[PDB]
Design a protein around this ligand. Sequence first.
Ligand SMILES: OC[C@H]1O[C@H](O[C@H]2[C@H](O)[C@@H](O)[C@@H](O[C@H]3[C@H](O)[C@@H](O)[C@@H](O[C@H]4[C@H](O)[C@@H](O)[C@@H](O[C@H]5[C@H](O)[C@@H](O)[C@@H](O)O[C@@H]5CO)O[C@@H]4CO)O[C@@H]3CO)O[C@@H]2CO)[C@H](O)[C@@H](O)[C@@H]1O
Ligand SMILES: [Zn+2]
Ligand SMILES: [Zn+2]
Lengths: 383, 136
Amino acid sequence: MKIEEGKLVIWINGDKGYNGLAEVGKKFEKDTGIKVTVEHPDKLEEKFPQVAATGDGPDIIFWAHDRFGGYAQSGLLAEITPAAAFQDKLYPFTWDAVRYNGKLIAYPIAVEALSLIYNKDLLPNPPKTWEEIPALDKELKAKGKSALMFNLQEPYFTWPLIAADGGYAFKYENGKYDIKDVGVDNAGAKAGLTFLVDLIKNKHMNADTDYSIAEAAFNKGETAMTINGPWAWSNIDTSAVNYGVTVLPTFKGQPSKPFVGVLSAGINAASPNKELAKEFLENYLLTDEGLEAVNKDKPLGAVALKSYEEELAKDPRIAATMENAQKGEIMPNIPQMSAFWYAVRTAVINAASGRQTVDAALAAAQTNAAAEDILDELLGEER
Amino acid sequence: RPRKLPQLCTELQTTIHDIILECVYCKQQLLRREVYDFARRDLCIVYRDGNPYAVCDKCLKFYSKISEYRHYSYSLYGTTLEQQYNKPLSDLLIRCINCQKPLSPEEKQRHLDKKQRFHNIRGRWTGRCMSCSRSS
Ligand SMILES: OC[C@H]1O[C@H](O[C@H]2[C@H](O)[C@@H](O)[C@@H](O[C@H]3[C@H](O)[C@@H](O)[C@@H](O[C@H]4[C@H](O)[C@@H](O)[C@@H](O[C@H]5[C@H](O)[C@@H](O)[C@@H](O)O[C@@H]5CO)O[C@@H]4CO)O[C@@H]3CO)O[C@@H]2CO)[C@H](O)[C@@H](O)[C@@H]1O
Ligand SMILES: [Zn+2]
Ligand SMILES: [Zn+2]
């Protein structure tokens, strides 16, 4: 049906603290009378452009900022105009993640980066280098365990290694992305993905390992290390594993370079509730009390709100999160990012499974990541 | 870097009859027919890693259909296009949606008369040429 006037419907991904967010929604309803419904649909980031293009969907969509430029280019997001006083409550670099063509298109919530999570009982001294892992795995397999398991189905998790020695998505210069300069099939990207494929070939990882398999193995104490973000920590807590969160291993002496996401809340351009959505987001969610309610459910990472982040920063897990973030790069928010991710997803899976060589997989992905833009050049108006 | 096939030929010291071109997407060699069709449709040479590429028919049709289905948008009558760019229709690049050939001045003036709109796809304006409007 059409978006309902006089309430708020929120979409947020199923790995985030949606029950905590619903608690913020209950506070809003208690104070204002406005009911807040929080949902976590499958593939919400693909559903949103479909249903919002017909004028339907949630009032507010949560996702990392990398999806939002495509939404805004399609006219699906309302322009955000907080007062200067509210803008100063959040870190400047998080506003930049949600700025598209000079306009704010979402509220930033929290900064996410992958870290190395390790079992302190199994592995008191986690490795500093990727190159140590195979020998470390041989050692741990003799103890009935293994060194490392992480999600190999989503390119988010393998990108830090691909980027370490030179891979990049779109070249960034003068505050701008050149979609003609894609770095998916260069020598550094090939080196990183080849190292990952060799780990699988040498029986240190399995190509089929996904989020659920890796999470279960680490939280059952079967593997010494995983790679994951802050949303995963509270399940590890309840599994009673004694864990640490630390800097990602280096590859060829270079830091792993995670793509940093800013969890962001956009307002549907079709919402008849834009004023209420702004009141909820600015004055209920983006407060100490509101972010704490979400954080208590699933940890947000380093939040955009300065007053609360200065408390979270004292947590060594948050310090490690931001150390890894600072070595990585903030994701572009340009419309081309989804094509980039779909392209690299196929490349990593095809290479990991041996269906394609590393070179053929990444050569295909380099093309797919820019297919639309290549078509624009072919059909454009030149000489 | 030459953007059009004749200049690329006048720069590798060859002709359109002889030039060997690969598709930007699949890297397969173009058939000679595809080379001629590339030039007649006034397509643009694209450079990747400093090398020139054209496009084969299969990939051009494949990614064209994607771009149409996945970047649907709006339509305008020619007079509005004229107002919007200030130039006459004959001065604007408008391609056939089906064969990608630039519309002729006659085909564009025909669109105007029949009160037919042009269609926007990812910032590209399209119509339908007379040849693709007369086929089994
Ligand atoms: O349909 C067959 C196919 O379905 C399943 O995979 C598909 C996904 O279900 C679907 O969501 C879609 O995923 C795309 C996604 O739409 C696209 O936006 C891009 O995703 C990026 C994120 O945008 C980016 O923010 C980041 O996501 C992080 C997130 O920041 C973080 O907070 C946390 O939630 O972890 C996320 C990573 O998991 O990274 C991802 C990229 O990894 O790219 C996605 C594709 O990789 O499309 C999938 C493929 O269709 C099944 O799993 C699959 O096996 C089936 O073949
Ligand atoms: Zn081709
Ligand atoms: Zn035609």
